[PDB]
């Protein structure tokens, strides 16, 4: 046989909440701001 081997690793931060890939890590962190919400008023 000797087919070979698999397994690669390429730096890439992507939001696993919506589905958006970014270049840096600070760009994604500033995006999760819209994801997180707050609780208080019932009506909402
Ligand atoms: Zn997102």
Taking the centre of ligand 1 as the mean of its atom positions, its distance from the CA of residue 44, in whole angstroms, is 22
Question: Residue 31: how many CB atoms within 10 A of its CB?
Answer: 15
CATH number reported for the structural domain that contains residue 27 in this entry? 3.30.160.60
**Residue 33 counted as domain residue:** yes
Structural domain tally of the chain? 1
Residue 36 · residue 30 · CB < 8 Å: no
Taking the centre of ligand 1 as the mean of its atom positions, its distance from the CA of residue 41, in whole angstroms, is 25
**Residue 21 counted as domain residue:** yes
Sign of the four-CA dihedral 18, 20, 25, 26: negative
Task: Compute CA distances 10 → 7, 14, 20, whole Å.
Answer: 10, 12, 16
Q: Which residue has the tokens 């992507």?
A: 14
Structure tokens at 43: 């009506």
**Residue 17 counted as domain residue:** yes
Taking the centre of ligand 1 as the mean of its atom positions, its distance from the CA of residue 36, in whole angstroms, is 10
- Nearest CA among 32, 12, 37 for reference residue 22: 12
**Residue 3 counted as domain residue:** no
Residue 13 · residue 25 · CB < 8 Å: yes
Structure tokens at 16: 């696993």
Experimental technique = NMR
Residue 22 · residue 31 · CB < 8 Å: yes
**Which residues have CB atoms below 5 A from the ion given as ligand 1?**
15, 17-18
Q: Which domain holds residue 25?
A: 11-44
Q: Element (H or E) spanning 26, and its range? A: helix 26-29
């Amino acid at each position: 046989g000797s087919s070979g081997s698999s397994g690669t690793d390429s730096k890439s931060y992507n939001c696993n909440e919506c589905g958006k890939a970014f270049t840096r890590i600070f760009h994604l962190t500033r995006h999760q701001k819209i994801h997180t919400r707050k609780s208080g008023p019932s009506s909402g």
